[PDB]
């Protein structure tokens, strides 16, 4: 299907063109309470999810899947995707997390919410790693698409579906290497960098699982209400 016959450059363009916008937090912005920070983030994540759902539809290969499979992948991947986005946006702000242009939080503001500073620290470490690696926008969009396709693929005939996903994943791998080769990296450097990028995805998975625990923990405590969509996505884990 369409996705498999795209060139590397066509794949990258498609992914770049699919990028969701950067959203703003609610401006309504004093020193933060636990409940207020929670409220801001919850509201922001909910709005972001709507844009992510529409981004996913523009990822070549994704709409080729059945609705059930698209749902499964999104339910598995959504928090990883929010996280890698956050980490990407925060690259140019060492020591801080750019949740939105009007919501740039440092580590100590992570203490406003109980158990949040752990996840913050992991996110900050990920941002540093991307900076140390000099991650490029074109690489980022590839990684984000890999997360979408990879994260639920092992937990599904639902075999020709798996094969298609694995074929798309192979295409994105080709695209990543292409980009590295164009940037003038040696063969050795290309396979080394590819490995380094993909190994970070293990850490992103870990962060997602910790964040999901945290999110379920805040639901039980009913400290702020979660949106219907967030609760739907959370229920899927």
């Amino acid at each position: 299907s369409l996705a498999l016959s795209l060139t590397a450059d066509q794949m990258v363009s498609a992914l770049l063109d699919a990028e969701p916008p950067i959203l703003y937090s609610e401006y309504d912005t004093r020193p933060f309470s636990e409940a207020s920070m929670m409220g801001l983030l919850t509201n922001l994540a909910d709005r972001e999810l709507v844009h992510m759902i529409n981004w996913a539809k523009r990822v070549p290969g994704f709409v080729d899947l059945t609705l059930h499979d698209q749902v499964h992948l999104l339910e598995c991947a959504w928090l990883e995707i929010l996280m890698i986005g956050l980490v990407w946006r925060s690259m140019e702000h060492p020591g801080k997390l750019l949740f939105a242009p009007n919501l740039l939080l440092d580590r100590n503001q992570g203490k406003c919410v109980e158990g949040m500073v752990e996840i913050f620290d992991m996110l900050l470490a990920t941002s540093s790693r991307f900076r140390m690696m000099n991650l490029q926008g074109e690489e980022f969009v590839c990684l984000k698409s890999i997360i979408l396709l990879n994260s639920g693929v092992y937990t599904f005939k639902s075999l020709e579906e798996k094969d298609h996903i694995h074929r798309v994943l192979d295409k994105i791998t080709d695209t990543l290497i292409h980009l590295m080769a164009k940037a003038g990296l040696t063969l050795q450097q290309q396979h080394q960098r590819l490995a380094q990028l993909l190994l970070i995805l293990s850490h992103i998975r870990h962060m997602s699982n910790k964040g999901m625990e945290h999110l379920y923990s805040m639901k039980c405590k009913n400290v702020v209400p979660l949106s219907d969509l967030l609760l739907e996505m959370l229920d899927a884990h």
């Binding site: 609705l67 698209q70 739907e232």
Partner: peptide
């Protein structure tokens, strides 16, 4: 459910 709506829009 909501996911289904948003995926079909």
């Amino acid at each position: 459910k909501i996911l289904h709506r948003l995926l079909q829009d």
